[PDB]
Amino acid sequence: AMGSMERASLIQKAKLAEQAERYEDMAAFMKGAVEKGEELSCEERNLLSVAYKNVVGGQRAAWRVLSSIEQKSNEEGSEEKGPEVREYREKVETELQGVCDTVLGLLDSHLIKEAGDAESRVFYLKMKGDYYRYLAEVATGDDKKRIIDSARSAYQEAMDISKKEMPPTNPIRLGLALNFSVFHYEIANSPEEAISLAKTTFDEAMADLHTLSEDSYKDSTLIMQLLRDNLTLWT
């Protein structure tokens, strides 16, 4: 749908969509930019991830509402409404899945293959881990296990690279750790691992802060605070 628009026009429109909180549009513009076949810049990767994060974020929030209703209507002494709650939860779930598959597909051809620099490769592998994780949040079937492992292996590979190649205060490194810790906590049923990861990550970033310019690491600061919020919630 975006094949007739210049790459630069798609990037510009993704930035306008962001300002207008039109995240579906933003995601469609960024998909079209990716499909031009050139690697994305640091700024363009951020637009890509923000667009899809917001689209799936709204779907996942809806899915959680509908799932909670559905689960309530399946309890002790709740009364039979009929199939509507389940159908509508399935409709939202299916659309969410289709957006995850779209992102995963863009990642696998060809953001991940062509990413040589550490900051881009870790960024894309983090996205791959995130979107498999959102698949795992709704998976109840045969392949829940395989989906969970796909998220784990993406996050693990990102983690391996980020440790070798990036400082501990790098905001991509920090975000990856934050999300991988969430994965361990609520997807992999490994809250000790989640806690240990969040703590180690936070502590190592604190100790490396002396190397940093400020206010040039406001992203790193915010993410350190989310790690702290999780540690507070979980301990």
Partner: peptide, 6 residues
């Protein structure tokens, strides 16, 4: 308080 991700 729902746990944070980014």
């Amino acid at each position: 308080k729902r746990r944070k991700s980014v």
